[PDB]
Amino acid sequence: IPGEGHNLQEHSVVLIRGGRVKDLPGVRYHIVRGVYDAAGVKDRKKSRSKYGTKKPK
């Protein structure tokens, strides 16, 4: 689960793309933010795409 803070928990419906984390062995997939019960990240301005965050005003 990528980024700072997350809203995920037991029974969260979730979407996953592949791609592993080097240091976290066994972990071979990534949770895609802003989809299903995965939140995007609040207060994220740069790279919003990679973090499922909508644009500010």
Partner: protein, 276 residues
């Protein structure tokens, strides 16, 4: 997401009825919708993407006044609650206007003992809490009628608002109501979005214990002005003097929070429980 309303249906006591349309104010069943769950806002393709107020009321009832203590290690507690307020949407980290400080709202004595347990022992933060949790509201029992003047035709630099509203008790649990029946134009078109804000901040501090006032109706029906000395921040201070005063008028009542409670106990202590 776009969606394609195929057929449109009505339901009778014995048969289904296809209809070619559903006019506003009415209702019926629409075939064809795919990813549209209940409690959603369907607009037309070329229409204001507004979202109707479906699925509502949060809503917290216990406030513990956490002071950031000392003093420049402040903004790290504000970076703790922030991630917290994304991990848990219920609670509000509201700020008090007069006293200026931050306030952790919640859903029970316990909701703050699991947060401000982790808030100290799962970050760090030099900060501390009292506190009670006094979370009452205020409302009115009878309707009354005052004036919202701001007669400062001086300085030449702004300062004039005059306001007249009928404030009546609403059904409890209902919250706010604002009907805008200005007639003639005796208050200009650009003094409405800031006489409403002139009211909506006046209810923020109450007349007995000083707590948010809900369950009211504010009918704006009259008021004068001075085109030269009338400022937008003169009807915004006008409606604060009428609302914080008309609520003092017609019987202001502390409403108070109440919990439905499911207590599980062995059959032996029942009476010991109940009678307590």
């Amino acid at each position: 997401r776009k969606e394609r309303v195929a057929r449109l249906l009505r339901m009778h006591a014995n048969h289904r009825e296809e209809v070619e349309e559903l006019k506003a104010g009415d209702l019926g069943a629409v075939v064809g919708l795919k990813e549209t769950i209940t409690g959603d806002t369907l607009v037309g393709e070329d229409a204001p993407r507004v979202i109707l107020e479906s699925i509502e009321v949060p809503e917290p009832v216990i406030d513990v006044a956490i002071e950031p203590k000392t003093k420049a290690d402040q903004e790290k507690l504000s970076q703790a609650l922030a991630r917290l307020a994304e991990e848990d949407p219920t609670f509000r980290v509201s700020t008090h206007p007069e006293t200026g400080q931050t306030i952790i709202s919640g859903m029970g004595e316990l909701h703050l003992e699991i947060i401000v347990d982790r808030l100290k022992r799962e970050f760090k933060v030099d900060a501390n809490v009292g506190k009670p949790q006094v979370a009452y509201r205020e409302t009115i029992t009878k309707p009354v009628d005052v004036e919202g003047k701001f007669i400062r035709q001086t300085g030449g630099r702004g300062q004039y608002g005059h306001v007249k509203i009928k404030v009546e008790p609403l059904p409890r649990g209902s919250g706010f109501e604002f009907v805008n029946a200005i007639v003639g134009g005796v208050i200009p078109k650009e003094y409405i979005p800031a006489v409403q804000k002139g009211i909506e901040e006046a209810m923020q501090s109450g007349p007995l214990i000083g707590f948010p006032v809900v369950d009211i109706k504010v009918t704006l029906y009259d008021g004068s002005y001075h085109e030269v000395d009338s400022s937008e921040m003169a009807f915004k201070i006008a409606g604060s003097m009428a609302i914080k005063e008309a609520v003092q008028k017609g019987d202001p009542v502390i409403l108070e929070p109440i919990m439905r409670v499911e207590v599980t106990t062995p059959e032996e202590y029942m009476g010991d429980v109940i009678g307590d």
